[PDB]
Chains A and B, each alone.
With several copies, the nearest count.
Chain A
Amino acid sequence: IDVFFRQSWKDERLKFKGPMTVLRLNNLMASKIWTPDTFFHNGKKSVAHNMTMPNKLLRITEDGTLLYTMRLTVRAECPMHLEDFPMDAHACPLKFGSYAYTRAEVVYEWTREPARSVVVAEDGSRLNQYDLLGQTVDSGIVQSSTGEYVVMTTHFHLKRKIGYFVIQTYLPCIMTVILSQVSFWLNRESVPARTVFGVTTVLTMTTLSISARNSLPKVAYATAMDWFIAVCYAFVFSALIEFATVNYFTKRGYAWDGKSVVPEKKTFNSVSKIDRLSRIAFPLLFGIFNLVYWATYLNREPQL
């Protein structure tokens, strides 16, 4: 996050009288006098921009009030619970406060009311896969080993966009499942063809399962996408298993030539009852699963 973090405080020592009611000083004068030592509790490694010079200013008013604006780029920790990935939502905190001074020495306050103190520029939103719904501003206390400190916090609420993973993982998995399901329509005697379907589709599902977590942290628990991939893997594996089953029951190696007549019960293998049931069952079971999964997982997170 890139911010114009700006603070103000009253220092009676710097009271003066002169022509102008406000003195706009260079960044050096800020280093010449006392200023707060505010830091970010969850920050990791930020930089105060100094191009072309330190992006700082100081405005001393006649009554002694100061105004010390900065231009910071803070990159901070945002702990996440990726149980509902890629359909999760987060609240990334931004917590800041004094480092040296306890409650009795320095206390922070919001200039305007808490809701309207933190303002986000409309045009400024570099999020790619996320959506910034809003922010909640609050204040509180932290009791550390040294003492008690005031911590002023702003939680930015983010929601992920599912669009990337619909084509990255979900659509390839569903197409692979339907590709395996297509094997039911071919004749039973074409053993190499249906074996090719089974092995190749389960290979593809294994590849997708491996590549699904190419970006996530190596979390121990299983995400929603992992459950979806597992069920797709189960469906393709069941298709290959039932092909093996029906092949076990095939009697005559030769297929049906284009000149013969099949008597009813050189005879020929009848079309499998297993295939007849599966053609309508397996797609229906996949449809019911997909509807249940999407209905369950779309509507889980809170609202306003």
Chain B
Amino acid sequence: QVQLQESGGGLVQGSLRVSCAASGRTFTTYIMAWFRQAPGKEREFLAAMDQGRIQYYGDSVRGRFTISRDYAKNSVDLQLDGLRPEDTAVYYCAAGAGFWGLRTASSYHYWGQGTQVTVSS
């Protein structure tokens, strides 16, 4: 089975780092991305990274979040800075070649269990 385990904090007042490790398949040639789900059932794209180290971002978080990949360890990391109270959401880690996508959840065939992150002022 192909598993996308996730890690990272859930409570912050701030800076954070959310990691995602893949097991059961080498995602060297796949595109690894992060998605956000605020309460309201509206999945939002956050960031994605290719085999060519090329980073794509959503307009809401351009320059606030930084995506990175570690190909030797087969993982994708997201460094979050400037967290605002509206950023409270469940962050999911996804992988898969971008067919008709690269900004749409329909193109990703693998998903993480998701991690809740909350911001309290």
Contact = CB atoms under 8 A, between A and B. Distances in A.
Interface residues of B, number: 19
B55 to A, nearest CB: 5
B56 interface: yes
B2 interface: no
Interface size class of A (residues with CB under 8 A): 20 to 34
A304 B54 contact: no
Interface in B65-109: 97-103, 106-107
Given A81-B29, A302-B107, A136 B100 contact: yes
Contacts of A41: 52, 54
A78 to B, nearest CB: 11
A89 interface: yes
Interface in B6-53: 29-30, 50-53
Contacts, number: 62
Contacts of B51: 79
Nearest to B51: A79
Contacts of B99: 89-91, 157, 301-302
B68 to A, nearest CB: 9
Nearest to B30: A81
Nearest to B106: A302
Interface of B: 29-30, 50-57, 97-103, 106-107
Please list the 10 inter-chain residue pairs (A to B) with the smallest Cβ-Cβ separation, ordered nearest first: A140-B56, A142-B54, A141-B55, A302-B106, A151-B54, A91-B99, A140-B54, A302-B99, A91-B98, A79-B29
Interface of A: 41-42, 79, 81, 89-91, 93, 95, 133-134, 136, 138-144, 151, 153, 155, 157, 301-304
